[PDB]
Amino acid sequence: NIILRVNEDKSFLRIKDVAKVEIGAEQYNSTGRLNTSAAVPIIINLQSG
Amino acid sequence: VTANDVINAVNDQNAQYATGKIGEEPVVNKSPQVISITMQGRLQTPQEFE
Numbered sequence: 440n441i442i443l444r445v446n447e448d449k450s451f452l453r454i455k456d457v458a459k460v461e462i463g464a465e466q467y468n469s470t471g472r473l474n475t476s477a478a479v480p481i482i483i484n485l486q487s488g
Numbered sequence: 489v490t491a492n493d494v495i496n497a498v499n500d501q502n503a504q505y506a507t508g509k510i511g512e513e514p515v516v517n518k519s520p521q522v523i524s525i526t527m528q529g530r531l532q533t534p535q536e537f538e
Contacts, residue, residue: 467513 502537503529 442451454460471480506527511519531537 463514 498537501529502531505529 441454443454443457444452446452471478473480508525508527510523510525511517512522
């Protein structure tokens with residue numbers, strides 16, 4: 440719904456008219472597999488000492 | 489030309505880099521190769537400055 444501009448006819452231009460907004464991950468680059476099954480891998484590092 | 493005009497020019501024509509990517513993960517085609525994009529504007533030579 441965000442209005443980019445008025446358009447000289449009181450009919451607002453909108454982000455929807457020029458784009459497709461959706462919720463989605465910032466980086467789709469990496470995935471994780473556990474025994475051939477999707478999973479997210481959380482690595483726990485040990486603190487020093 | 490005022491000095492202010494000149495300061496602005498240098499600030500724009502001599503600029504830092506911007507990186508993009510080609511054929512990344514969101515695309516549906518799933519291009520076999522993912523090539524990075526490099527944009528540079530840094531000026532190193534005195535002549536380039538002039």
